[PDB]
Amino acid sequence: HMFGSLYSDERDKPLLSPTAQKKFEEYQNKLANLSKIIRENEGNEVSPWQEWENGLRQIYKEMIYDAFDALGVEMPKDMEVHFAGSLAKAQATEYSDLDAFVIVKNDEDIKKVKPVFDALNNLCQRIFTASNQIYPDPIGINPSRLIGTPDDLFGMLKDGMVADVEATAMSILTSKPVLPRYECGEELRDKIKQEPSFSNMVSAKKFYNKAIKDFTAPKEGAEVVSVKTHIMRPIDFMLMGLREEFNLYSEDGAHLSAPGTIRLLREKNLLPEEQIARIESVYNQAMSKRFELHAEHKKEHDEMPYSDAKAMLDEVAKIRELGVQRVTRIENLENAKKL
Amino acid sequence: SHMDYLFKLLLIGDSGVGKTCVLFRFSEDAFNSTFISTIGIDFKIRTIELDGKRIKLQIWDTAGQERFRTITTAYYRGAMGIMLVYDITNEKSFDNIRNWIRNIEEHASADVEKMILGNKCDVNDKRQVSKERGEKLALDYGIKFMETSAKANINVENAFFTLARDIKAKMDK
Numbered sequence: 225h226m227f228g229s230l231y232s233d234e235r236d237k238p239l240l241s242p243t244a245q246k247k248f249e250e251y252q253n254k255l256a257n258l259s260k261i262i263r264e265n266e267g268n269e270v271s272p273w274q275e276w277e278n279g280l281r282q283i284y285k286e287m288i289y290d291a292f293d294a295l296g297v298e299m300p301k302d303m304e305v306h307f308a309g310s311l312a313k314a315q316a317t318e319y320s321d322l323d324a325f326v327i328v329k330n331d332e333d334i335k336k337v338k339p340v341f342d343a344l345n346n347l348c349q350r351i352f353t354a355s356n357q358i359y360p361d362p363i364g365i366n367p368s369r370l371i372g373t374p375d376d377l378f379g380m381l382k383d384g385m386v387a388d389v390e391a392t393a394m395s396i397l398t399s400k401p402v403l404p405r406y407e408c409g410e411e412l413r414d415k416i417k418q419e420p421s422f423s424n425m426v427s428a429k430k431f432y433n434k435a436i437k438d439f440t441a442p443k444e445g446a447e448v449v450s451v452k453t454h455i456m457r458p459i460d461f462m463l464m465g466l467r468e469e470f471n472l473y474s475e476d477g478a479h480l481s482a483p484g485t486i487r488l489l490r491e492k493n494l495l496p497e498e499q500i501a502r503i504e505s506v507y508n509q510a511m512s513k514r515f516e517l518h519a520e521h522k523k524e525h526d527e528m529p530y531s532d533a534k535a536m537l538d539e540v541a542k543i544r545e546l547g548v549q550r551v552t553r554i555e556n557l558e559n560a561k562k563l
Numbered sequence: 564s565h566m567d568y569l570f571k572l573l574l575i576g577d578s579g580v581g582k583t584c585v586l587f588r589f590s591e592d593a594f595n596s597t598f599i600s601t602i603g604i605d606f607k608i609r610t611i612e613l614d615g616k617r618i619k620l621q622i623w624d625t626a627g628q629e630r631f632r633t634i635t636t637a638y639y640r641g642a643m644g645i646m647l648v649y650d651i652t653n654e655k656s657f658d659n660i661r662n663w664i665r666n667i668e669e670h671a672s673a674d675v676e677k678m679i680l681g682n683k684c685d686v687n688d689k690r691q692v693s694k695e696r697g698e699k700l701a702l703d704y705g706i707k708f709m710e711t712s713a714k715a716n717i718n719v720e721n722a723f724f725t726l727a728r729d730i731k732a733k734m735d736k
């Protein structure tokens with residue numbers, strides 16, 4: 225067959241044209257340079273994972289502008305692109321997936337814009353096949369699957385039109401704007417929080433209980449544990465719980481990172497310092513470990529020896545005890561016993 | 564959480580002068596030593612108090628890269644305050660301040676507050692632009708001037724509060 229354009233499907237066009245290939249390599253070099261910049265400046269007051277999210281957001285934005293230019297499509301002014309997952313929280317590693325979705329103001333923008341995001345998914349997939357990075361999940365959060373008006377996307381959740389409503393709802397709620405455009409995102413999040421049938425799946429109690437009951441401690445005698453399942457997930461849900469309880473929000477998504485939440489908990493003295501410091505300490509230890517593990521294996525490697533995880537697991541257990549007290553105090557607050 | 568005013572601020576200047584680091588210092592009280600060039604336009608939110616009034620600062624951080632200048636220019640109209648940043652170690656970046664000023668005059672609102680920041684004032688051993696030349700160019704355009712350091716945390720807070728004060732004084736009358 226024939227050479228592929230930069231936005232060709234690699235299954236149909238394994239070989240890029242000489243022009244497309246030079247541009248593909250430019251993107252690969254940007255990702256490689258970003259990893260190199262992180263290593264060289266070890267001990268910077270900006271964490272490796274905060275630096276990665278910053279670098280990757282600039283790279284992805286450049287891919288978006290390049291793609292609109294290449295396909296001869298003008299970028300609508302009222303179109304929003306949002307990061308979801310670890311990237312939205314600025315705790316994605318180099319081998320994390322690239323979860324993004326698109327909110328448009330008008331339904332007719334979709335026909336104009338969806339081809340550009342199909343093109344971008346092809347490029348991202350080709351990069352994934354080459355360096356095992358920026359995976360666009362075809363059954364998850366990608367701008368080709370999740371594109372529409374706030375009404376459309378809320379409709380997907382309210383009706384059946386997506387498998388795992390709860391996980392898509394979590395993704396949309398913990399999303400961060402990539403462009404300086406956030407109002408449609410706000411409208412979408414307010415519709416999800418409005419929906420009576422979503423009432424208790426979006427509550428602080430629910431998020432605290434996921435940290436306590438879902439993402440539970442490793443079994444006794446375990447030799448192996450997951451820095452994701454047993455440490456980073458419980459922390460994530462504890463922080464979602466606190467953000468919901470205290471209405472913590474920034475239009476720029478600054479609240480979604482652990483340090484962002486911790487900054488706000490400290491500013492407003494919303495939690496005792498001892499407890500904030502524990503969450504902060506285990507977050508930094510776990511993300512240092514998780515960032516190292518992925519870079520070393522060049523893939524999502526979350527398993528580590530129980531013995532290496534022991535200090536973090538014990539702090540995570542204290543954080544769960546805290547979480548149980550918050551759920552009780554929330555139930556007790558809604559009851560309001562007098563005398 | 565209460566808001567009395569929303570001030571729309573714009574950072575403009577050559578790629579590499581430290582617009583992103585000036586805002587990073589203001590918004591997160593940290594310094595990033597690495598150079599990750601801004602693509603299109605970024606924004607940070609920070610609420611401040613002036614005269615017992617809550618002022619939400621919506622701060623647009625523009626690409627200095629020439630490529631994004633059509634996108635960048637479109638924001639001039641909406642800006643209530645504009646920071647013009649040059650780098651005291653880069654003569655070329657100071658020389659372009661007159662061009663940046665001409666572009667504000669052409670595309671910005673008639674009564675937009677302006678401030679010139681001579682950034683990287685911690686790097687005295689590589690200085691190419693004397694402080695007085697900065698003050699002199701600023702005085703000639705009747706625009707307020709400060710030397711700043713995102714790294715050494717010098718005049719970053721003062722710059723943003725002084726620009727916000729000038730905006731507030733203008734619209735209070």
Ligand SMILES: Nc1nc2c(ncn2[C@@H]2O[C@H](COP(=O)(O)OP(=O)(O)NP(=O)(O)O)[C@@H](O)[C@H]2O)c(=O)[nH]1
Pocket residue numbers: 576577578579580581582583584585595596597598599600601602625626627628682683684685686711712713714715
């Ligand atoms: N010594 C010193 N270096 C600084 C200072 N401010 C920024 N820098 C450095 O200058 C480089 C560029 O800073 P950056 O904020 O990215 O510049 P920018 O104007 O946003 N660039 P662009 O327009 O391309 O987005 C980085 O290496 C940064 O660490 C400062 O006050 N002092």
Ligand SMILES: OC[C@H]1O[C@H](O)[C@H](O)[C@@H](O)[C@@H]1O
Pocket residue numbers: 309310311313394395398456457460461464
């Ligand atoms: O880092 C991504 C995180 O986002 C949300 O909290 C999700 O519920 C979960 O997938 C994860 O904890």
Ligand SMILES: OC[C@H]1O[C@H](O)[C@H](O)[C@@H](O)[C@@H]1O
Pocket residue numbers: 396397398399413467468471472473479480
């Ligand atoms: O009210 C604050 C909360 O509102 C929404 O749930 C947002 O998705 C969440 O990030 C934020 O912390």
Ligand SMILES: OC[C@H]1O[C@H](O)[C@H](O)[C@@H](O)[C@@H]1O
Pocket residue numbers: 684685687694710711717718
């Ligand atoms: O604002 C006072 C400043 O004056 C000069 O710019 C110096 O280089 C700087 O170090 C000092 O702090």
Ligand SMILES: [Mg+2]
Pocket residue numbers: 582583584599600601624625626627
């Ligand atoms: Mg920048």
